[PDB]
RNA sequence: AGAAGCUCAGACGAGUAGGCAGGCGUGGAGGUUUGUGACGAAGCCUUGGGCGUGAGCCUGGGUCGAACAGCCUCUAGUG
RNA sequence: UCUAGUGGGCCAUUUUUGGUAAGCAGAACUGGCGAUGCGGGAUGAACCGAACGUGAGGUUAAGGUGCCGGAAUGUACGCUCA
RNA sequence: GUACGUGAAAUUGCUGAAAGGGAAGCAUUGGAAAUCAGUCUUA
């Protein structure tokens, strides 16, 4: 069964804030794997996506999507900075998020 | 007395012609080609000038002279199409060629909507 | 914008309607060349990230203007003949395939572009039912299918373990770190 | 240029939530305590002139139209030069006669009706 | 007069009014919520559970003050009581709601209330005296009861999704 | 090119007491609109739609029953 | 040229008077608050940074990066056991 | 239907929907559910 996750496992640490202002336009991103922003430079411009399911079947499916890039590092522990089509929701704190491989440079 | 007194009264602000809203106003005047309240599309306000309208399935367009301005009822003379839209096209610019031609633009779009008006009309 | 310089029976146009159809200004961008990767050198093994085939793996064969028309010898992965945009495949350091022997220059726009619709009505249970392999896929596509996957077997079978490696699928494992890994 | 909105949400005035007597139309603040006057941090936000929206899309529709109140056929008839421009809207008192009047004269121009249904 | 609910249609439904009746209003809705869904025989026989002291209606929203009793644990409440003045004014308006179902001809074993709707009627001005010479308001709340009893009564598909479906078809069978 | 229009460019934007300008809305008057209306005016309600930075305006649905409005100006017991 | 409002002020730096002292009274220069939000000082009218049309991106001030909290459980050399 | 034109708000009952661990209301951003229009359809 281990054939698959062309991705790599991400968690939606909060958003862009300071000590009481929040700006929910960008999220800040954990890569697994990822601990410094030389490491995060890999991951610059990769596509991450918020997977979600619903009752409801929209196109006939069970799971909707939310599509996102990776914009930048985020201090030096590896944390990158993305920007959704859709900004996340503030209950996806500790969620998990899937960093494809493309757009690809390697 | 003269037809930039004549705009300075009427047009600007009131006229039987005018149609104001919220900042934009229209020119209901049936001798105005373009609609708008303007010195260059006011035949009240300004010398000689044409225009178009409809009826029963033909167009017919006014006209003006200068010497025949004191005269209401002989001062626009009127001129009859019921051919075709290209041929009305002809008309007006031909009938305007001599003239300010200013106006053929603004005239043609008017004929050849007016046209499509009755095209509409009979689908 | 007169008569007299375009006459006819019937006018250059009918109608003349609305606003004098603002032109657009004369842009100053030319095409040019796509500067393609360095790595994706034809006959290069790469792994397809997206699509129905993603992480297959596939021989390249030549580089379209934006694109890699790619394949996987038939016979071993069931990739047929595709273009793949260069954004979306990991070029492997494994050792490359002889591809001189097989034409290229016949995969082009033209020979991978759909059909024209121009209408919005689609879809239908007897469309899904068209298309497929069985149906359409014209006997021309199928004999240079044949031709290249035959000419490429005599590559993949001199250099050993790479038939069971491109029939194999990549896909990672836990433990794996992409920006480590070199492929 | 496609239609954008600055600002989409109304500018409700202070306090209309809490009171009935206080309507939600939008009041200045006068107050000399006031906490959305002197505009402290997370209070409600003020009408502004940056709020205004571009000249070249002011006004009109999010189909690019400009809504244009009608009476009856002559004032359809007035929308004869401008029905790229203007979109006619039936007004409310019009009866069921002239309103299906003032439609086919709004269809046969050409000009497209905000409330046909 | 127009009624509360847009059901009641004359096919199956019967109906009882009582307009400016004087009795508590509070008392009246804690009765009406009481019986709100049983049927007309069991109702029947709880409200003369209730005027015997048998069974008791349990005051929900205006209990301020109301003592407990053993007879609300029933309803899993602990404040109840026993309005007969309400109990009278609920059962004379259902005695006459079944004689309309029985004019009308509708079966009698499965009537139900299926709606019962009690209204604040216009005050009763009275007058009570109070120390140092003041005089104060000793108002009625009169109550509007109505009664209605009655009978017991696509996608579409992608172009991907489509041709994966139909190979998945094929492949099955 | 409603020359009271059109067009190019740069700089700037806190605000109580206070000043000034341009607008929004209400009752009545002169002019105007081949203006709306018992085939439903005004008013009222609305988990509908649109416009404006805003004051505010428009509209669909419901309720209703005899009048009412846009533009130019006059006026005031005008928010 | 005509006219409004004001003609109770308060705080900080430095200089200083009366005072046992004061979140005390009285002055001098400058800056603030009153009239002024915003980031920091946990919080606070005048402290530190910075002064404000509506937004996007980037970079910073004062202040900070164990967790609450965005950001090194960083690097180097020491002191400290309460 | 004389407790009579129109029949507003406060307040109230019923129904449906959702929320609720010592207040509520509000602003920003999106999820979920509900609801809706433009747009295209054509030239």
């Given at each position: 069964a281990q054939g698959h996750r062309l991705y790599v496992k991400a968690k939606h640490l909060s958003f862009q804030r300071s000590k009481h202002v929040i700006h929910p336009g960008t999220s800040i991103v954990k890569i697994e794997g990822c601990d410094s922003k030389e490491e995060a430079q890999f991951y610059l411009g990769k596509r991450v996506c918020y997977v979600y399911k619903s009752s409801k079947a929209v196109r006939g499916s069970k799971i909707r999507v939310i599509w996102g890039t990776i914009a930048r590092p985020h201090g030096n522990s590896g944390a990158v900075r993305a920007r959704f089509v859709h900004n996340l929701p503030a209950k996806t704190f500790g969620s998990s998020l899937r960093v494809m491989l493309y757009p690809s440079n390697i | 007395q003269q037809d930039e007194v004549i705009w300075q009264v009427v047009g600007h602000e009131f006229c039987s012609y005018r149609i104001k809203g919220e900042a934009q106003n229209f020119c209901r005047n049936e001798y105005n080609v373009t609609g708008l309240c303007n010195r260059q599309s006011c035949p009240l306000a300004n010398s000689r000038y044409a225009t178009v309208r409809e009826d029963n399935g033909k167009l017919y367009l006014y006209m003006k002279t200068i010497e025949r301005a004191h005269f209401p009822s002989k001062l626009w003379q009127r001129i009859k199409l019921s051919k075709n839209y290209?041929?009305?096209?002809?008309?007006?610019?031909?009938?305007?060629?001599?003239?300010?031609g200013r106006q053929?633009?603004?005239?043609?779009?008017?004929?050849?909507?007016?046209?499509?008006y009755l095209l509409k009309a009979r689908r | 914008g007169e008569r007299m310089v375009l006459p006819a029976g019937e006018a250059a146009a009918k109608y003349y309607p609305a606003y004098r159809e603002n032109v657009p200004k004369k842009a100053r961008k030319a095409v040019r060349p796509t500067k393609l990767r360095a790595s994706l050198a034809p006959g290069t093994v790469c792994i397809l990230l997206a699509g129905r085939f993603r992480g297959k793996r596939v021989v390249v064969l030549s580089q379209?203007?934006?694109?890699?028309?790619?394949?996987g010898?038939?016979?071993?992965?069931?990739?047929?003949?595709?273009?793949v945009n260069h954004r979306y495949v990991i070029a492997t350091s494994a050792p490359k395939i002889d591809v001189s022997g097989v034409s290229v220059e016949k995969f082009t726009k033209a020979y991978f572009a759909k059909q024209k619709r121009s209408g919005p009505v689609k879809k239908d249970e007897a469309f899904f039912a068209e298309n497929a392999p069985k149906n359409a896929l014209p006997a021309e596509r199928i004999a240079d299918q044949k031709a290249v996957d035959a000419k490429l077997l005599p590559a993949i079978k001199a250099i050993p373990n790479m038939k069971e490696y491109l029939a194999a699928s990549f896909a990672l494992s836990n433990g794996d770190r992409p920006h480590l890994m070199k492929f | 240029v496609n239609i954008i909105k600055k600002r989409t949400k109304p500018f409700k005035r202070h306090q209309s939530d809490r009171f009935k007597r206080v309507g939600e139309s939008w009041r200045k603040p006068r107050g000399i305590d006031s906490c959305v006057r002197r505009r402290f941090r997370g209070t409600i936000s003020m009408p502004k002139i940056?709020?205004?929206?571009?000249?070249?899309?002011?006004?009109?529709?999010?189909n690019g139209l400009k809504a244009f109140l009608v009476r009856n056929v002559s004032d359809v008839e007035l929308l004869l030069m401008h029905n790229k421009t203007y979109a006619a809207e039936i007004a409310g008192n019009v009866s069921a006669r002239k309103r299906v009047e003032i439609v086919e004269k709004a269809r046969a121009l050409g000009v497209k009706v905000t409330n046909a249904g | 007069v127009r009624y509360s609910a847009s059901p009641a249609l004359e096919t199956k439904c019967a109906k009882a009014r009582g307009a400016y009746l004087r009795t508590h209003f509070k008392n009246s809705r804690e009765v009406a919520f009481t019986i709100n869904g049983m049927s007309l025989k069991k109702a029947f026989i709880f409200l003369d559970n209730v005027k015997e002291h048998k069974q008791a209606v349990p005051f929900?929203?205006?209990?301020?003050?109301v003592g407990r009793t053993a007879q609300g644990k029933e309803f899993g409440v602990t404040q109840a009581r026993w309005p007969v003045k309400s109990v009278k004014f609920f059962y004379d308006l259902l005695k006459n709601a079944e004689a309309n179902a029985e004019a009308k001809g509708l079966d009698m074993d499965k009537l139900i209330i299926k709606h019962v709707q009690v209204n604040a009627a216009p005050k009763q001005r009275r007058r009570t005296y109070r120390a140092h010479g003041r005089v104060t308001a000793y108002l009625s709340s009169p109550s509007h009861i109505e009664i209605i009893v009655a009978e017991e009564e696509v996608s579409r598909v992608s172009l991907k999704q489509g041709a994966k479906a139909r190979n998945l078809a094929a492949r099955k069978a």
């Open positions: - | 290209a041929k009305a096209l002809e008309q007006i610019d031909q009938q305007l060629l001599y003239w300010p053929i633009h603004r005239c043609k779009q008017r004929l050849t909507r007016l046209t499509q | 379209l203007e934006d694109t890699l028309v790619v394949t010898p038939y016979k071993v992965n069931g990739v047929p003949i595709r273009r | 940056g709020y205004g929206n571009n000249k070249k899309t002011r006004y009109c529709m999010p | 929900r929203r205006f209990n301020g003050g």
